[PDB]
Structure formats: structure tokens, C-alpha cells
UniProtKB/Swiss-Prot annotation, chain B:
The chain holds residues 495 to 632 of 709 of the full protein. This is DCC-interacting protein 13-alpha. Overexpression of an N-terminal domain (residues 1-319) or a C-terminal region (residues 273-709) has a proapoptotic effect. It is linked to Maturity-onset diabetes of the young 14: A form of diabetes that is characterized by an autosomal dominant mode of inheritance, onset in childhood or early adulthood (usually before 25 years of age), a primary defect in insulin secretion and frequent insulin-independence at the beginning of the disease. Homodimer. Binds RAB5A/Rab5 through an N-terminal domain. This interaction is essential for its recruitment to endosomal membranes as well as its role in cell proliferation. Binds DCC and the catalytic domain of the inactive form of AKT2 through its PID domain. Binds PIK3CA and subunits of the NuRD/MeCP1 complex. Interacts with OCRL and INPP5B. Interacts with NTRK2. Interacts with APPL2; interaction is independent of follicle stimulating hormone stimulation; interaction is decreased by adiponectin in a time-dependent manner. Forms a complex with APPL2 and RUVBL2.
């Protein structure tokens, strides 16, 4: 977690869905995924949301099960290449995870109106890493 | 041309961050802990997907819409296993560079067929690397 990380910011999120995406450095990719995921959920009658905790640290983003406090998923910060909220709905937050063996997945979440706050927290973690450089 | 493109029905049971190491027991220890947690917390739900095995990657695909939900580069899949006496479980570790996550699935008694497929995928990929 953040034994050794100044940053340790926890957010309540609800996972909406993910898609494979093109590996580019364009933030419009997040918006397009949000559009596709939100449409697909509505059209296929997907209303179920499960609450997770999103942890932002200096080294990674983690998704934690609030029942068990078990880390279900971890995303190393260098691989989180794009992150954004939606100008027309700041409840939304998405990011792109780029893997190197080239392969990218965009992950979309809803929050309790914390899209901008999450983005600032990830942005701060990215800034620390650029300074450490 | 003949290409590896093998689909399997799988139901996702859970995943957890694990320590990065070649320790092959990691998948089985993860299986135990995920199964125990599901029992403790009275979890019934397990989302169905299609697992696609190719020489380049594993993908999880929405069975109804054919959308690729997740993709796992084959070189990052550093451990994978089923149980011979319980081929209704399949799991693997995805290692990104080191951070590792173990993913656990239920299969329709096809755990050995999945493992054989992923092994063939890895052989095809090794052939291209050596060429």
C-alpha cells in the first residue's frame, strides 16, 4: 500500500467496465470509452454496481474490496498513461493502463462526484514521479 | 493459414495482488484464499466471459456483445495452472514490469484443456522469437 509512500488517498468508486483500446497518448480515448461503456450498460440493462476503494499511492493505483480489505487489482503508476474525468459528468473517472511485453485497456468508474479530485491525486502522484526522475 | 484462436467459457471468481516471484504454488494459494473469501461473504455471483487464447495474448470477451473487456499479453502470463483432480478451476499470474496479479476462474471442467491451449500459444510465440 503506502508503508513507504507520502500519498495514500482512498476514494469510493464503482467499476462500470473496461475495454481494450488503441495504444496512443490521446486523452480523447478515455472519453470515447466512457461513451461506449455507458451506452452498452444502458442498452444491455446493466444496472449493478459494486463499490470498491481506489487507492492512489506514489507507486500505483490499487483497487481494494471494502469487505475484506484485500487488494484485488494493482496498476503500476508508470503504466497509467492517461486519466480523466468527463466535463459533462464529474462523477466519472477513467484511466488507460498500457502494458509493455503495445497493449492498452481503459477502465471506467463512477464516484461520489470525485472525478476531478481523483484526477488531481493521480496527477500529483505522476508529478512526484517526474521529480524523482 | 492455420492460427491458434481457441475460445473457452469461464466464470470469473476473483483476483488478488500477489508477490512477484516464479513460485508456482502462488496460483493454488490464491485459489484457496479467493474460494474461502467467497464462502465467508456468501458470494454467489461469478461473471461469465469468453476466454480467447492466441499466440499473442489472452483476452476476456463479453459473450453477448463480443466486446474485449480485458487483454493479457502472453509474455506477461508467467504462471498458469489448473488442478488435475479439480479441472473446474483455472488461474494465472499476470506480471507487469514488478507488479503481479493472480486471476482465478471457474471452467466447465476444461481447466486442463485451457492449460494445454495456453502452452501451445507459448510454443507458437517462442517459435516466432527464435525465428
Amino acid at each position: 500500500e503506502t508503508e513507504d509512500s507520502i500519498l495514500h488517498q482512498l476514494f469510493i468508486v464503482r467499476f462500470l467496465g473496461s475495454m481494450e483500446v488503441k495504444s496512443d497518448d490521446h486523452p480523447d480515448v478515455v472519453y470515447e470509452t466512457m461513451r461506449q461503456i455507458l451506452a452498452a450498460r444502458a442498452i444491455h440493462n446493466i444496472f449493478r454496481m459494486t463499490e470498491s476503494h481506489l487507492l492512489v499511492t506514489c507507486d500505483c493505483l490499487k483497487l481494494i474490496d471494502p469487505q475484506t480489505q484485500v487488494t484485488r487489482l494493482t496498476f503500476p503508476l508508470p503504466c497509467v498513461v492517461l486519466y480523466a474525468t468527463h466535463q459533462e459528468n464529474k462523477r466519472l473517472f477513467g484511466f488507460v493502463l498500457r502494458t509493455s511485453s503495445l497493449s492498452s485497456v481503459c477502465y471506467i468508474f463512477e464516484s461520489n462526484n470525485e472525478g476531478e479530485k481523483i484526477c488531481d491525486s493521480v496527477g500529483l502522484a505522476k508529478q512526484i514521479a517526474l521529480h524523482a526522475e
